Amino acid sequence: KTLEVWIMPNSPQPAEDFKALVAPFEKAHGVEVKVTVLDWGVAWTKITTAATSGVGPDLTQLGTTWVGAISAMGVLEPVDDVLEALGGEKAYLPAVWRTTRLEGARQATAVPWFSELRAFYYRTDALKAAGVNPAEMFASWQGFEAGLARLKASSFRDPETKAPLAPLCTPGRTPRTLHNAAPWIWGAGGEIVRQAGGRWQSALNSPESLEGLYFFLSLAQKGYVPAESLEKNTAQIEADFQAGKCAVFASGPWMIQRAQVPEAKGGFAERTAAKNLGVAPYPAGPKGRYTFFGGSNLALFNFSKNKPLAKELLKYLGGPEAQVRYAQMTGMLPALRSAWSDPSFQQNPLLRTFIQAAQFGRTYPSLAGWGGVENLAVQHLGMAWDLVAQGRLTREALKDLMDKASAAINQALR
Ligand SMILES: OC[C@H]1O[C@@H](O[C@H]2[C@H](O)[C@@H](O)[C@H](O[C@H]3[C@H](O)[C@@H](O)[C@H](O[C@H]4[C@H](O)[C@@H](O)[C@H](O[C@H]5[C@H](O)[C@@H](O)[C@H](O)O[C@@H]5CO)O[C@@H]4CO)O[C@@H]3CO)O[C@@H]2CO)[C@H](O)[C@@H](O)[C@@H]1O
Ligand SMILES: [Cl-]
Numbered sequence: 001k002t003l004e005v006w007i008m009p010n011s012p013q014p015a016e017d018f019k020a021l022v023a024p025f026e027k028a029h030g031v032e033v034k035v036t037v038l039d040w041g042v043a044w045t046k047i048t049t050a051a052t053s054g055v056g057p058d059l060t061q062l063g064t065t066w067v068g069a070i071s072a073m074g075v076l077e078p079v080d081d082v083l084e085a086l087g088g089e090k091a092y093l094p095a096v097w098r099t100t101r102l103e104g105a106r107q108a109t110a111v112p113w114f115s116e117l118r119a120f121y122y123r124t125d126a127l128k129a130a131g132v133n134p135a136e137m138f139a140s141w142q143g144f145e146a147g148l149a150r151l152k153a154s155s156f157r158d159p160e161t162k163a164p165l166a167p168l169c170t171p172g173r174t175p176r177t178l179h180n181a182a183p184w185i186w187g188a189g190g191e192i193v194r195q196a197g198g199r200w201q202s203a204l205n206s207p208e209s210l211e212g213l214y215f216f217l218s219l220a221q222k223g224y225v226p227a228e229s230l231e232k233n234t235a236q237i238e239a240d241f242q243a244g245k246c247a248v249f250a251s252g253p254w255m256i257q258r259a260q261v262p263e264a265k266g267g268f269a270e271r272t273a274a275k276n277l278g279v280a281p282y283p284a285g286p287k288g289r290y291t292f293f294g295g296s297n298l299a300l301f302n303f304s305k306n307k308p309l310a311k312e313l314l315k316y317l318g319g320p321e322a323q324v325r326y327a328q329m330t331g332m333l334p335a336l337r338s339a340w341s342d343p344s345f346q347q348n349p350l351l352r353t354f355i356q357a358a359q360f361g362r363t364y365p366s367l368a369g370w371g372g373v374e375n376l377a378v379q380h381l382g383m384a385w386d387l388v389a390q391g392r393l394t395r396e397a398l399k400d401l402m403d404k405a406s407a408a409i410n411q412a413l414r
Contacts, residue, residue, distance in 0.1 A: 002034050005022075018037075044066065054075075057301065064099035068103060077304070087336070092337060113296045113318070115293070117253070118180075121249050121250075130156060151165070168248045184213060213398060230388060256354075293362055294363070
């Protein structure tokens with residue numbers, strides 16, 4: 001007997017970490033667990049192929065944003081019995097509870113595995129040379145621009161690159177997701193889709209949503225983001241934060257874990273970045289503080305022939321002990337609220353800011369169509385980055401792009 005599980009690269013040796021995690025399960029149950037690791041760029045397609053063909057694992061990891069769309073295909077086993085065993089609705093942040101199901105659906109089709117949310121890493125050394133107070137830089141949108149202007153005029157140079165630092169690094173390539181932009185949209189009072197009149201519509205083109213996007217993209221148009229970042233994707237901008245080219249960069253909590261790991265083992269501990277590492281939450285916008293709150297869930301294909309064992313492995317992976325163990329390996333946060341108290345998370349000062357930032361965690365609605373919305377958003381957003389790369393993003397050019405993304409998104413939804 002072999003359980004087949006699919007995971008994404010959640011830690012530097014993802015398959016080994018996962019196998020070490022489930023070994024007590026294997027012994028207690030006298031079964032073997034076979035792990036496949038799919039990269040984040042293709043995971044969506046091979047998972048969707050598995051759902052359409054009925055050929056695949058027992059369990060798969062899903063990004064919290066995917067659960068809506070796979071559940072709607074009617075390929076996932078109810079796990080209301082697993083969630084019940086784990087403590088039920090009371091044992092999660094509503095931010096996590098909303099991702100166990102298709103929005104509006106009767107029954108849970110996903111168990112929360114881990115959580116993650118976005119904040120700003122900075123270089124403690126570089127802000128201190130600019131004479132920038134991080135409590136003021138990251139307090140509001142004026143604070144931030146003031147932070148970046150001072151960071152741009154600083155004579156500071158990285159010890160190892162003996163070169164000045166990019167003030168903000170963010171990617172300008174067509175994004176995979178609105179993960180980077182969403183907090184700007186939200187903090188301006190805006191949103192990506194809106195529920196009204198018994199329908200979801202695009203709000204990408206609202207005054208609020210454009211205010212947020214333009215504020216964010218125009219930072220790049222004012223020389224806070226160097227041209228070279230406009231041509232890179234998330235993973236490139238992250239190597240560059242690690243190799244000492246950027247003073248400020250928005251990411252998830254895993255980069256705290258990787259900073260303690262040697263470059264050989266898939267981290268950056270030897271880098272200066274790692275020795276001089278700060279975290280601050282997104283600054284408050286005109287209409288609130290928000291950050292993108294996400295993570296991954298586990299779901300059982302209803303065409304699995306190992307559904308009993310696969311539920312005990314769900315109950316295993318979702319329960320306090322394996323919750324603690326895997327968050328430590330991956331540098332993510334447990335999904336189960338009780339596991340957040342562990343001193344491993346509480347007494348790590350950088351991970352503490354992510355934990356306090358989580359009060360302002362916001363999520364995407366779990367709509368069957370959510371992938372289709374996000375894909376059209378990001379396509380249009382990519383055409384906005386290309387105008388920034390010309391110095392040609394104006395308010396009206398951005399309105400025009402988002403009125404076109406809203407026309408296509410509306411069609412998709414209706
Ligand atoms: O929208 C989908 C879904 O997204 C979730 O968010 C995901 C996000 O989509 C992913 O892109 C992101 O991926 C990061 C991994 O979590 C994290 O493990 C990884 O960290 C290390 C990695 O562990 C390490 O092996 C890697 O090493 C490279 C070296 O640095 C290079 O020198 C060498 O050449 O190549 C190796 C690679 O073999 O480096 C990285 C970076 O330090 O970083 C990934 C990239 O950012 O994970 C997010 C969280 O899971 C979101 O949560 C869901 O809600 C959403 O639905
Ligand atoms: Cl973006």
